[PDB]
C-alpha cells in the first residue's frame, strides 16, 4: 500500500535544458513522457545555488543556513564541515521508520573526509550504498574504471557512468520489488568536465552542424578540451543529457515489467542551476553559485499515476526543502522530533491551491569565496528581494513581469522592499545566518 | 653617498635549497660567493607562510595581521582584498622621498583585480614596472611568450623567464648607474608548475642518476607532468635554482663593470617556505602555508662591502618586517607618519647584539581555507608557541634543542606556555587579528 519513492537528481542541470522546459536542441523524450504522465513545476527551486548545500536541504529538510552548510564541501583539508548523522534524522532514516528499504546510487557530497567518512551515506543509515564517491569528485571521471568510485570495482571496458548508475537503479528496483523502497538516484552528470560516449557526441555534433552550418561543431568544440563556449547549445551537455533521459526510460520500463509503475512515485530534479559556459538556464539571470533565478530554479517533474493528474503544469513556488515532508506524508509518517523548514506538497500535487509562504536563501560563499555572488534572498509571491554584501545593496524583482531579473525595482517600490527586508533579516536571526567572508 | 639597494626575492624557495644552507645537490656558486662576501642569517623569517601576505609585510613594514592580508590573494572574483596605495606609504615611496629611483622586475601579488589594477605596482609609485603579472599567475608560464606577463611583448624564441628577469635587472642597473636606486627583483621562480631550460634539466637528471642510479631520474620524473615526488632532490627545482644563481652572478658582474659593487647593498630572500613534494626545507617541519618553521624560515644573505663583514653567520631571529626600517636607515630617512612593526638591522649587520624582541605570525587561511594549518604563533628567544584553532590546542617548541619542532613542551613547561600565550593574545588584540574561517 505504501508507495515506492524514486528521487532522480541531476548535477548542475539548468532550468533551460529539458524538452518539456522549452529546449529544441537537447532530446529528452522519456522525461517529456514523464512530464506528460505527471506534474511539471515552472518555479521549483533548489534551497541553495550549489551542490552540497542543496543536497543537505533534501536529506535534512532544513534550511542550509540553519545546518551551517551554505556552500559546496571542498577537499577534506579545506573544511571542518560535514553532515553529522548524530545531528539529523535524515530522509532515508525517516522512511526506514515508515517501513521502507532505502538505497543511494551515486553522489553524496555531504562529507569530504574519505579517511574516516563519519558523514558518508552508510553512516547516515542507507541500507544500500551503490557507487558513491570514494574521493573528492572535482572534475570527475565518467569512464570505467571510475577514478572517483572505488566501490565500482567491476564494470565493462569503457563503460559510461550515467549508464552504470541507471543499470544499478533498475537492479535495485528488481531486487526490492516485494517491499516499499526509497531510491536516491544521485547522478554525477551533468557535472564538468563534460564527457559522453562517442556515438552520442557525434549525433549532437552532426545536429549542431545541421543548425550552425558544416564544420561549426569542430570550430567551437580538439581546440576545446573542456568542451565549453558562450554558444547556448552544447553537444557534450546534450549527449550527457540524452544518456540521463534513456536511463529514466529504462527505470520507467523496469517499473512496468515488475508491475510497480502504479504505486511508485518518480521525481526528477537538479541540485542547482546550470554552470556558466556549459549549461542552459533559458532567459534566467546567471547560474550556478548565484541566488539569481538561474542558480536556484530547477526542472521538477513529479509522477504518481492516478494520485497526480498527468500533463499538468504548476506555477506555484516550491523548493528542495519540500521533498522530506512530502515523502513522509506519501509514506504515512509524522515528523518524529526533528523540525522541518519545508511543507508537504501532496495537497498541491493533487490539484490544491498554494499558501504563498515566503522562501529564503543564504549564500555567504564560505568555500567558493565568490565576493560578488555573496548574498541572501527572500521570495514572497512574485516579489524577490536579494541583499548583496560586497558592494552593499538591495535588489527587488517582479518574477511575473521580469523573470530574467533585468529591472531592479528596489527604489521604485520602497514599501515592498522594506517589507521583504524585514522578513529576510528576521529569518537570518532565526537560522543564525553565517556572516559573509569579506575584508 | 646613499647606497643602491637590490632586493632579490625568490618565490617558494625553501630554507634547505642553497649551497650556503647545506644543500649538496643544487648548485648555487654565485649565492655561495654572495654568502662569503656578506652575512648569512640561519633564523631569518617571512612574516607570513604564503606569497601575498609576506610581500605585503615587505612593502608596508606592517604585520600582515594588521594590514588584513594574512593569506594569498586569489583570482579577482574570489577576493575584495588588495593593497591600497592610499592606506600605506610603501617601501618604494619612502626611498623615493630619500632621493632613490625605484624599480620592480616581476611578481606583485598585492592586487589581483587586473581590470582596474588600482593596487598594482605602478599605482603604488614604482618609477619602473618591468614584467609584472597582467593576469592571475596560478601555475605560471616560464617560456616566452609569457602568458601571465603581457608587458613582455618582445623577447627571444623560447626565452626562459628567470633569464629575462635578471637581464632586466642588469639593464635597470646600467640605465640608473648615475643616481641612487632601489631595485625590487621579484622572481616568479621557483613557483609551481616547475619548468626550466632543457640543458639545465638534463644536467640535474644526469646528476640525479649518478646518485640514485641509472634511469632513476626518468623513473621518479613523462609520468611526471608536474615534476614532483617525496624524494628530497628535485632536478627541475635544481635547474630553476641554477637559473636564479647565474642571474645573481650576472647582477654581481654588472655592479663591478659599472663600479657600484662598493656602495650597492644586495639582499637575497624568499617570500615563504618550500612547497611540499617540490621544495627542500632541510630538517624543518612542514612548509608553505604552515606556521611551522618550514613555512616561514627563509634564506637571507645581506652583502654591503666594507659596511658588512664578509663570510659571517648570524643566528639572531629576523623577519621580512625588518627590510623597510633597515633600507630607510641605509638611505638616511625617518619613518614619515607611517607606523612600522619591524626593526632596523644595521646595528646587527655591523656586528651588534640582538634585543630578543618577540616575533608574531597569524594564519587564519582566509583564502586556502586550510583548517588544520589555521594558527597564530609567537617566538621569543628559542621558545615558539603555536596556537591551533581546528582541534584547539597550544604547541611549545625549543628551536635550539628542537629546530624540527618534533617535541611539544606545552604541558611540560606550563609557565613559559602561559607567558607566550599572554604575549600572543595581547598581540592579536593590538593588530585586530581576523578570526579563523571554521564551522
Ligand atoms: Ca551541482
Ligand atoms: Ca611564495
Ligand atoms: Cl592539511
Ligand atoms: Cl570567515
Ligand atoms: Cl563574480
Ligand atoms: Na541521522
Ligand atoms: Na576512467
Ligand atoms: Na602609498
Ligand atoms: Na609560453
Instruction: Enumerate the distinct ligands.
Output: calcium ion, chloride ion, sodium ion
SS strand fraction of chain A:
15-25%
Secondary-structure content class of chain A: alpha/beta
Radius of gyration of chain A: 21 Å
User: What does the main sheet of chain A amount to?
Assistant: 9 strands, mixed
What order do the SSEs of chain A take from the amino end to the carboxyl end, as H and E?
EHEHHHEEHEHHHEHEEEHHEEEEH
Shape of chain A: globular
Number of strands of chain A: 13
Alpha-carbon distance between the termini of chain A? 57 Å
The protein's oligomeric status is homodimer
Classified in CATH, the superfamily of the largest domain in chain A is Alkaline Phosphatase, subunit A
CATH topology of the largest domain in chain A: Alkaline Phosphatase, subunit A
CATH class descriptor of the largest domain in chain A: Alpha Beta
Percentage of residues assigned to helices of chain A: 25-40%
**In the residues of chain A, how many domains can be counted?**
2
PDB class: hydrolase
Keywords: hydrolase
Assembly: dimeric
Entry title: Crystal structure of sulfatase from Pedobacter yulinensis
Keywords:
13 strands, Alkaline Phosphatase, subunit A, globular, binds sodium ion, homodimer, 9-stranded mixed β-sheet, alpha/beta, 2 domains, Arylsulfatase, C-terminal domain, 439 residues, 4-stranded antiparallel β-sheet, binds chloride ion, binds calcium ion
Summarize the topology:
Two copies of one chain form a homodimer.
Chain A: E1 4-10, H1 29-36, E2 39-45, H2 51-60, H3 64-67, H4 91-96, E3 101-106, E4 128-130, H5 161-175, E5 181-186, H6 198-212, H7 216-220, H8 235-257, E6 264-270, H9 293-296, E7 297-303, E8 312-314, E9 318-319, H10 323-330, H11 346-349, E10 359-363, E11 375-380, E12 383-388, E13 393-398, H12 414-430
Parallel strand pairs in A: 1-5, 1-6, 2-8, 2-9, 3-4, 3-5
Antiparallel strand pairs in A: 2-7, 6-7, 10-11, 11-12, 12-13
Helix pairs in contact in A: 5-8, 6-8
Bound molecules: calcium ion (2 copies), chloride ion (3 copies) and sodium ion (4 copies).
The site of one sodium ion (NA) has 6 residues of chain B, from loops.
Protein name (chains A, B): N-acetylgalactosamine-6-sulfatase
Binding site for Ca(2+) (chains A, B): 11-12, 51, 271-272
InterPro entries (chains A, B): Alkaline_phosphatase_core_sf (IPR017850), Sulfatase (IPR050738), Sulfatase_CS (IPR024607), Sulfatase_N (IPR000917)
Amino acid at each position: 500500500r505504501k508507495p515506492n519513492i524514486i528521487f532522480i537528481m541531476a548535477d548542475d542541470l539548468g532550468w533551460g535544458e529539458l524538452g518539456s522546459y522549452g529546449n529544441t536542441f537537447n532530446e529528452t523524450p522519456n522525461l517529456d513522457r514523464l512530464s506528460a504522465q505527471g506534474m511539471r513545476f515552472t518555479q521549483a527551486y533548489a534551497a541553495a545555488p550549489v551542490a552540497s548545500p542543496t543536497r543537505a536541504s533534501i536529506m535534512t529538510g532544513q534550511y542550509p543556513a540553519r545546518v551551517g552548510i551554505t556552500d559546496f564541501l571542498p577537499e577534506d583539508e579545506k573544511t571542518d564541515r560535514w553532515l553529522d548523522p548524530t545531528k539529523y534524522v535524515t530522509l532515508n532514516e525517516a522512511l526506514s521508520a515508515s517501513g521502507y528499504h532505502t538505497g543511494i546510487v551515486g553522489k553524496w557530497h555531504l562529507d569530504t573526509d574519505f579517511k574516516l567518512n563519519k558523514g558518508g551515506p552508510k553512516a547516515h543509515g542507507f541500507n544500500e550504498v551503490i557507487g558513491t564517491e570514494s574521493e573528492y569528485i572535482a572534475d570527475g571521471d565518467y569512464f570505467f574504471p571510475y577514478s572517483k568510485i572505488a566501490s565500482f570495482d567491476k564494470g565493462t571496458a569503457n563503460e559510461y557512468l550515467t549508464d552504470r548508475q541507471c543499470a544499478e537503479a533498475n537492479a535495485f528496483i528488481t531486487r526490492n520489488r516485494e517491499k516499499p523502497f526509497f531510491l536516491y538516484l544521485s547522478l554525477y552528470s551533468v557535472h564538468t568536465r563534460l564527457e559522453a560516449p562517442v556515438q552520442l557526441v557525434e549525433k549532437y555534433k552532426q545536429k549542431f552542424d545541421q543548425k550552425y552550418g558544416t564544420g561549426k561543431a569542430e570550430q567551437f568544440f580538439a581546440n576545446n578540451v573542456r568542451h565549453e563556449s558562450a554558444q547556448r547549445d552544447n553537444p557534450w551537455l546534450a549527449a550527457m543529457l540524452e544518456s540521463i533521459d534513456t536511463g529514466v526510460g529504462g527505470i520507467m520500463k523496469t517499473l512496468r515489467e515488475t508491475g510497480l509503475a502504479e504505486n511508485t512515485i518518480i521525481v526528477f530534479f537538479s541540485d542547482n542551476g546550470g554552470a556558466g559556459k556549459a549549461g542552459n538556464n533559458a532567459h534566467l539571470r546567471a547560474g550556478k553559485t548565484w541566488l539569481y533565478e538561474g542558480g536556484i530554479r530547477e526542472p521538477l517533474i513529479v509522477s504518481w499515476p492516478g494520485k497526480i493528474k498527468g500533463n499538468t503544469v504548476n506555477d506555484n513556488p516550491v523548493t528542495s526543502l519540500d521533498f522530506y515532508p512530502t515523502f513522509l506524508a506519501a509514506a504515512g509518517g509524522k515528523p518524529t522530533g526533528g523540525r522541518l523548514d519545508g511543507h508537504n506538497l501532496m495537497p498541491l500535487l493533487r490539484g490544491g491551491r498554494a499558501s504563498g509562504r515566503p522562501l529564503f536563501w543564504h549564500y555567504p560563499s564560505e568555500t567558493g569565496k565568490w565576493v560578488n555572488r555573496m548574498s541572501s534572498a527572500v521570495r514572497e509571491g512574485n516579489y524577490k528581494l536579494l541583499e548583496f554584501y560586497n558592494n552593499p545593496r538591495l535588489e527587488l524583482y517582479d518574477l511575473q513581469n521580469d523573470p530574467s531579473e533585468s529591472h531592479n525595482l528596489a527604489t521604485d517600490r520602497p514599501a515592498e522592499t522594506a517589507r521583504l527586508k524585514k522578513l529576510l533579516e528576521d529569518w537570518k536571526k532565526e537560522v543564525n545566518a553565517e556572516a559573509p567572508h569579506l575584508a
